[PDB]
Design a protein around this ligand. Structure first.
Ligand SMILES: [Ca+2]
Ligand SMILES: [Ca+2]
Ligand SMILES: [Ca+2]
Ligand SMILES: [Ca+2]
Ligand SMILES: [Ca+2]
Ligand SMILES: [Ca+2]
Ligand SMILES: [Ca+2]
Ligand SMILES: [Ca+2]
Ligand SMILES: [Ca+2]
Ligand SMILES: [Ca+2]
Ligand SMILES: [Ca+2]
Ligand SMILES: [Ca+2]
Ligand SMILES: [Ca+2]
Lengths: 66, 66, 66, 65, 66, 66
């Protein structure tokens, strides 16, 4: 929704989005999306869900990128 | 023109472009392009040209993309 | 192979790949690839192999973009 | 909003987002973005707003970029 | 070292890799990688494995990306 | 140079660059730039300049990046 996005970009809440706030916001979103993708990928490799990739989980991932 | 393009990369003026000067140039050019693009987008949203994006301007922009 | 790669990624040598480890490795590898490509490009201009592009080399390159 | 977003990827209105609709939505969204950008760029070069870039306009623009 | 990859690129078996063979290979590999990634994302959201994202599954996804 | 560029973009030769012309050109130039880069890489691997990569050239390249 238009209103919430505005409030999030407007960090100093003065009701004017500056160029610097736009730039910060775009960088922040890009960072968040890249971190989300990497976690999604990690969780896909970590079959047994324990937070680590063992050598057998790894080996399976690696043969399968084909 | 040839000299001018070389001089732009050769930031310490020694008449030779080092590998670090190439890397720095490739970064600077990419950063300039991204600034230019972002500034252009910004200016397109900033309908009254006052250097800031107000909620009204922001709603008009959000609405006309999706 | 998978083995060597697992070892490379497992920087702390504890036999497990952590998410922090995956992040480090992805950043490392991205950086290496960029550096390889920029080196390959630089080497193709640096015709005498001395580690600098001189103006003559530059003009041979600027001259040839066809 | 999750419904708004869902209802948009779900092109055929069957309440199910297929893999093909994901792939199409991703492509569509990429296309629209690029077109919008190219529109802005063009407009920025076409100072007099006549719908064409003349060599005078192209020359200015070739200045900065 | 490199033999399997060279043979995979060298599609006509002449013991040479041509520019067109390299190009066809790079495109082929890029197409498969983009497919594997998008499939991975899809599958992570399709929790019941039925090949569709239903509204519950999607809301869990979109909610989970904050 | 600029006029050479402008004339190249002005496909219909009417002295004006249209929006359709700009679109046509961006796709063209994108394609050209991607070919040019792949070409530069290829040429760097093809040490003997016969226009083909033989196995000993390929192995050398592969080793250099491994
Ligand atoms: Ca503000
Ligand atoms: Ca695990
Ligand atoms: Ca220098
Ligand atoms: Ca304004
Ligand atoms: Ca104002
Ligand atoms: Ca470890
Ligand atoms: Ca040199
Ligand atoms: Ca559907
Ligand atoms: Ca004009
Ligand atoms: Ca061949
Ligand atoms: Ca499902
Ligand atoms: Ca024309
Ligand atoms: Ca050769």
């Amino acid at each position: 929704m238009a209103e919430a996005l505005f409030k999030e970009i407007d960090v100093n809440g003065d009701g004017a989005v500056s160029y610097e706030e736009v730039k910060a916001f775009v960088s922040k979103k890009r960072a968040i999306k890249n971190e989300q993708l990497l976690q999604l990928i990690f969780k896909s490799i970590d079959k047994d869900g324990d937070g680590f990739i063992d050598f057998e989980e790894f080996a399976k991932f690696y043969g399968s990128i084909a």
